[PDB]
Amino acid sequence: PQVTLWQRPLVTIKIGGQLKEALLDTGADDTVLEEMSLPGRWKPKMIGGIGGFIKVRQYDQILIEICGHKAIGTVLVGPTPVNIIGRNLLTQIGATLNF
Amino acid sequence: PQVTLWQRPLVTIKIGGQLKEALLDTGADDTVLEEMSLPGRWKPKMIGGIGGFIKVRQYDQILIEICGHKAIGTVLVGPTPVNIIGRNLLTQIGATLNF
Numbered sequence: 001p002q003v004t005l006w007q008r009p010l011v012t013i014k015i016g017g018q019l020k021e022a023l024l025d026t027g028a029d030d031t032v033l034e035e036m037s038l039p040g041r042w043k044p045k046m047i048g049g050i051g052g053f054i055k056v057r058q059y060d061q062i063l064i065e066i067c068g069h070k071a072i073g074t075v076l077v078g079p080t081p082v083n084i085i086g087r088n089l090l091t092q093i094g095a096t097l098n099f
Numbered sequence: 100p101q102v103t104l105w106q107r108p109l110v111t112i113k114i115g116g117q118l119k120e121a122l123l124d125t126g127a128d129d130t131v132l133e134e135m136s137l138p139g140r141w142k143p144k145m146i147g148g149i150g151g152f153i154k155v156r157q158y159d160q161i162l163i164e165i166c167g168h169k170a171i172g173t174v175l176v177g178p179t180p181v182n183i184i185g186r187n188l189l190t191q192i193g194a195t196l197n198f
């Protein structure tokens with residue numbers, strides 16, 4: 001759908017059998033979810049933002065269903081304040097930014 | 100314009116006589132620019148992001164051109180690693196996110 005930016009663009013994602021709300025974030029390269037349980041294996045990694053780095057777990061081939069749209073990607077799971085859907089997934093749902 | 104998100108969505112902005120590139124960021128509530136000289140009066144503000152919080156200085160009523168769009172707003176300048184146009188100016192240029 002089209003979304004304005006007066007409110008922050010949140011959508012509902014289904015991941016790991018769990019339903020969450022997440023930010024659609026053009027500025028984020030990767031998707032970063034707060035701590036939750038996935039099954040399977042992961043790897044450590046650090047990402048950066050404002051403030052600095054966080055260490056995160058990298059899970060590959062995770063199916064996310066964003067709004068209704070299935071997508072399979074890597075998600076990072078860690079101490080983010082907010083769940084973030086980032087460009088690696090935005091591309092798969094076809095998101096565009098218009099101005 | 101319309102931008103897809105396979106690459107970082109960077110635009111040229113002109114602020115304070117200076118040419119910068121900036122990231123259009125739907126996840127960011129506020130616009131946050133790296134350190135630069137700006138005329139005037141500022142208040143320190145603390146803001147948060149992934150990885151922590153930064154203290155920034157707030158100039159209000161700055162004119163910024165982002166593509167050929169003048170917008171006037173509050174701009175926070177400080178130790179971000181990228182300049183980020185956030186929803187406060189995104190709204191003034193009429194940007195929309197779509198899927």
Ligand SMILES: O=C(Nc1nc2ccccc2[nH]1)c1cccc(CN2C(=O)N(Cc3cccc(C(=O)Nc4nc5ccccc5[nH]4)c3)[C@H](Cc3ccccc3)[C@H](O)[C@@H](O)[C@H]2Cc2ccccc2)c1
Nearest residue numbers: 027028029030047048049050126127128129146147148149
């Ligand atoms: O993949 C990521 N990395 C990464 N991949 C890697 C691969 C390999 C190696 C290393 C890697 N590293 C990554 C994923 C998600 C977010 C980020 C970092 N990231 C933010 O950190 N941010 C804070 C941000 C940016 C701009 C403005 C604000 C803001 O206004 N905050 C605010 N708080 C307030 C409190 C009081 C009053 C006013 C306030 N205003 C906040 C918000 C997301 C966010 C929103 C809310 C809460 C937490 C996070 C932006 O949306 C994001 O795009 C982005 C912006 C950004 C992008 C790059 C560098 C720095 C920053 C990075």
